[PDB]
Amino acid sequence: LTFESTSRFAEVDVDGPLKLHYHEAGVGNDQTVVLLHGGGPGAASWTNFSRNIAVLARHFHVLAVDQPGYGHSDKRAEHGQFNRYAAMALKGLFDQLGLGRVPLVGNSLGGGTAVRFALDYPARAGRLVLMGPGGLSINLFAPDPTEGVKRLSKFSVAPTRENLEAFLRVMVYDKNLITPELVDQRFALASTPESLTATRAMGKSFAGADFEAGMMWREVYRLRQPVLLIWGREDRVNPLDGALVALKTIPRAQLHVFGQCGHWVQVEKFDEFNKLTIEFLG
Amino acid sequence: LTFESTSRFAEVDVDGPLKLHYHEAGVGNDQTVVLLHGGGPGAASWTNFSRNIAVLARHFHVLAVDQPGYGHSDKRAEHGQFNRYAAMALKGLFDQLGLGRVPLVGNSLGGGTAVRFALDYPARAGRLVLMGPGGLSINLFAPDPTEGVKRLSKFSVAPTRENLEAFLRVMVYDKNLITPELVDQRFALASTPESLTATRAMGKSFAGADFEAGMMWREVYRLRQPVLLIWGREDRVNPLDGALVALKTIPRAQLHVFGQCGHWVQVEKFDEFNKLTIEFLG
Amino acid sequence: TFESTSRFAEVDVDGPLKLHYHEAGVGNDQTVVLLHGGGPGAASWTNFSRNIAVLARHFHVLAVDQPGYGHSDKRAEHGQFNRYAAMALKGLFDQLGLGRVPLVGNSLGGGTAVRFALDYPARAGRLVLMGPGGLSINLFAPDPTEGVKRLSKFSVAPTRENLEAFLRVMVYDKNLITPELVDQRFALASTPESLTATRAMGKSFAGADFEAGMMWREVYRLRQPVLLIWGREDRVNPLDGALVALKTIPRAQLHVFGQCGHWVQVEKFDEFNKLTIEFLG
Amino acid sequence: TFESTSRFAEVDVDGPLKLHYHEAGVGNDQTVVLLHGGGPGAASWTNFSRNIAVLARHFHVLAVDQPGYGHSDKRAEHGQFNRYAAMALKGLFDQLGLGRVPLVGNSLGGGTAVRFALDYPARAGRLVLMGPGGLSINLFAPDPTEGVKRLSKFSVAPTRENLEAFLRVMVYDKNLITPELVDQRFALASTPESLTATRAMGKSFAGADFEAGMMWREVYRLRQPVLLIWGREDRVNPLDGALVALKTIPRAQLHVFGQCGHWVQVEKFDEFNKLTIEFLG
Ligand SMILES: NS(=O)(=O)c1cc(Cl)cc(Cl)c1
Ligand SMILES: NS(=O)(=O)c1cc(Cl)cc(Cl)c1
Ligand SMILES: NS(=O)(=O)c1cc(Cl)cc(Cl)c1
Numbered sequence A, B: 001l002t003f004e005s006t007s008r009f010a011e012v013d014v015d016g017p018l019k020l021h022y023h024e025a026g027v028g029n030d031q032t033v034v035l036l037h038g039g040g041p042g043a044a045s046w047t048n049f050s051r052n053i054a055v056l057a058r059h060f061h062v063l064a065v066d067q068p069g070y071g072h073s074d075k076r077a078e079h080g081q082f083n084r085y086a087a088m089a090l091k092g093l094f095d096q097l098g099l100g101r102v103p104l105v106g107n108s109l110g111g112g113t114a115v116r117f118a119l120d121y122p123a124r125a126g127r128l129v130l131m132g133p134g135g136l137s138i139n140l141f142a143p144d145p146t147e148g149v150k151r152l153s154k155f156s157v158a159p160t161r162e163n164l165e166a167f168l169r170v171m172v173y174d175k176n177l178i179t180p181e182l183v184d185q186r187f188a189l190a191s192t193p194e195s196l197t198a199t200r201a202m203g204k205s206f207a208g209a210d211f212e213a214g215m216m217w218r219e220v221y222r223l224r225q226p227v228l229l230i231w232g233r234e235d236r237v238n239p240l241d242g243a244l245v246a247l248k249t250i251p252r253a254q255l256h257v258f259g260q261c262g263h264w265v266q267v268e269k270f271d272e273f274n275k276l277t278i279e280f281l282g
Numbered sequence C, D: 001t002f003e004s005t006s007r008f009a010e011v012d013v014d015g016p017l018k019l020h021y022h023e024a025g026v027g028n029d030q031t032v033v034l035l036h037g038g039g040p041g042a043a044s045w046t047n048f049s050r051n052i053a054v055l056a057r058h059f060h061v062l063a064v065d066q067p068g069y070g071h072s073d074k075r076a077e078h079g080q081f082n083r084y085a086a087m088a089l090k091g092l093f094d095q096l097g098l099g100r101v102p103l104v105g106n107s108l109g110g111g112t113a114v115r116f117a118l119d120y121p122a123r124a125g126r127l128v129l130m131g132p133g134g135l136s137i138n139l140f141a142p143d144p145t146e147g148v149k150r151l152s153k154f155s156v157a158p159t160r161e162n163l164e165a166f167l168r169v170m171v172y173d174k175n176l177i178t179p180e181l182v183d184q185r186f187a188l189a190s191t192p193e194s195l196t197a198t199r200a201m202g203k204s205f206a207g208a209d210f211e212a213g214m215m216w217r218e219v220y221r222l223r224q225p226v227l228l229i230w231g232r233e234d235r236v237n238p239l240d241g242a243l244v245a246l247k248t249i250p251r252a253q254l255h256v257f258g259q260c261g262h263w264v265q266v267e268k269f270d271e272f273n274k275l276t277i278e279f280l281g
């Protein structure tokens, strides 16, 4: 497994052709799992889930999808509420690949996409594993915008190297993870005009009349499947108090909280996260 | 493994000889683990950890100790703050068995004993697994006494079969676990004069000037080992809000919460609890 | 007096519905509507005994018996209760010619106040909500709470002993639960109309319109100032149920009283009256 | 006026310590001590500008510059700060012949108020604590909070731009942060004595007496009524830090203002004044 061997493209229909890039691994395993990455500038499937795709592929058929706006998937200048938009895309990939009811793994932005998908297409979503998820989270104590969200915005307005490192450092508990190479690589991807276009589209979509589609804490009481919520105690993007409504209202919820862990659970607690996910998904 | 094959007795010194009953299993395994049962009338090591001792013994050298006042351990009419009292007893067993630094597993009352032990004898306690633990818990939202605590008290004042079933039913999420046989067996053990004596001793000890020894939420910021907190979402004895100070202040804490689970985690979520414990303890 | 303030009105909620209420302080510039808590034998006058007289020196007070309670109609059928009660209140508003009126609500009535403010937004002003149902969601307390359990137990087995047990976990200071109070509530709760109202309440929970009671989902939409008041020791609607509403209601405030249960306006009556009067004017 | 109310006293805390304070409303029956928040350039008069005059019509007000702030001594060394300040306040109490006095404290000063009430229990009456340090423990917010981070950043790099950034996450309404305010605070914070006080504060955190600042451990011992006041949007000492104290202080109350930050007595000054006056008498 390299970026190239696993790379795949599909074209789906979401008000018109939409190219989705994903990675496929562990082919031949009976049970398929879909991984949905976190947001943040420069984010994509391969780098987000580097500490995991290989391990998970020893147990599952893994499909790690670049959400629209990220990675090598299309970066339209236009789009509605994002989680719903990405969920519609994922629905097209599901139909195309002939996929049935599949468990979903989602980190941060992609966790929100996972939930939106599970709500909109309930027969198609199996068990959920959600790490510092957006969407279903609502920060009952932390004033919004959080520190993490503010630094992301500040990057979006002024896309400098300094603003990106500042953002990345409040993503993780262990700031030694934020190396010069990580910052440089992420900045190179995030700084392209296409990615800047996608950032503009993400910004305008917030003003949309479909905003309620992002407020999934209002809806997850309807989720019938087991759901494993995973949180870094020190998450400064989507803080721990945001887990509470979901834990309370999802009937078959579990919550796991890691001390000394930020927003990036699958990297910062990669060994522990992998065993939980593998056990939880069978 | 039967009650008889695993049964062991030791005499330790806590202001005088104190007979401790415990169960020993999986002899020959390199790493020793001590299990400390929950409170409640009729409670003891074998019945509390019935769904677990066998499984854990496939990986560890298991020592499940009847705390003083419970099981076949001594039921003195007199004793000071309980967790400290039971911890002193456990210290004597540790010294006698030549035990070094050992991980501890504790449910409810015994979780408090585990913590008190880890605080008082810090070099002797390894990783902790704590299920709906007393002591370190402090119910920030739930008015005290909780429902669970009130029904236990009501049994203590009026030790009837009806009061014991009522108590047992708020111990678990799935009330079908509370069968006629369970109630009868527990009532038979709890109703003996010796056990009634131990209940009186437990009651008087609350009035003691050493009460601060029970307030372990004040002290667990000192715990240096990894600690796995495990909670039933629907725990009505030690409710979930009681986990928060410990999660915040123990540097290497983790928390796992099971939906559809009460105070009796190791029974109600026995398969999941066993894999977490085994993985966490190595 | 009970009699001097007593009023009746008949409105349309899927047919005639007779509503009883108490009116006081007429002539005052600002009208305020009071909505009592639930529980057996509850009604406007006895729920708000420590408050109507004080409030009427500042406001035009309308204390309304919600359907199923007091001297208001006790239908044997009805859908989600807070919406049902809100529809009734809406009828009363149009009839009395009210504009935008602040609402005061304890427990059940707090839920009705909120449902009303959501369903008829132009008609509700500032809200004072004491241990309110509806907008509360117990993030930590397992449901049903001990309060709700004892209330249910009475519904199944309506004995004096079971009512007393409910009334006793309603309050921090159990000395407020006098034998006379128990006897007064029990005589009222034990009538066949009242048991019909109780049975009707329980069935409504099974309704397809249940989402209407999940008001924590919707209060981010409230634009008016809202003052939440809670007893730290509330065992019916515990304190953790305040949190979503505090977070999501933009002009929210919260006051918490230590040594206070579910019945705020009684157990902390002087402080409640002063808080309410200032917040409302 | 600043000058008319200004007073100095010298007490013993391991040697002479000069304390500055403001005195008003002399002759009133009940004395009240005010303890300002922290942050660079903070002092009694400017912290409590919207409050001293109003409070002095009801109480005998003593607003004390805590050591390290205002015109009080700024030693380059000192142990855990709230105990240090409390020892100073204790000196002032004996000298002025005070008995049992209610305390009002914002942020840092709230922590000092609490430390004082614990260390000299006979000398403290009712407490009013606004976004207080010391007794707070942020159960959900990762530490250091964004507020504390920007405060630290100023300590390392004391620029106008960094002070403004701190002042701006101190408050909900950023229009309160006027250029003039920034300039006033910065001129005071930038003096070499003040930087010495700032450097001293940071080192004290490394002290062996750190447990003295962990007052959430001890307030279950407070016997007096305590009124906690918080801004919902406090980014220095966030709202989740109120919870242990609310739970464990037996006669506690809590008030939370939506649309309010760390600087409660300014951002919600009319409501704060009224709450304080009623609670204290
Ligand atoms: N709060 S959230 O999970 O939805 C989220 C997280 C990140 Cl890092 C980025 C975006 Cl655009 C959104
Ligand atoms: N709150 S606690 O864990 O300490 C506890 C639980 C039970 Cl079931 C019994 C006793 Cl005596 C004490
Ligand atoms: N949870 S609630 O406020 O809606 C409530 C309280 C009482 Cl005391 C009774 C009823 Cl039926 C409902």
Ligand SMILES: NS(=O)(=O)c1cc(Cl)cc(Cl)c1
Binding pocket: D037, D038, D039, D107, D108, D109, D111, D131, D132, D133, D134, D151, D201, D236, D237
């Ligand atoms: N967390 S705290 O209240 O103690 C506090 C607040 C401020 Cl603004 C400054 C200082 Cl040094 C300390």
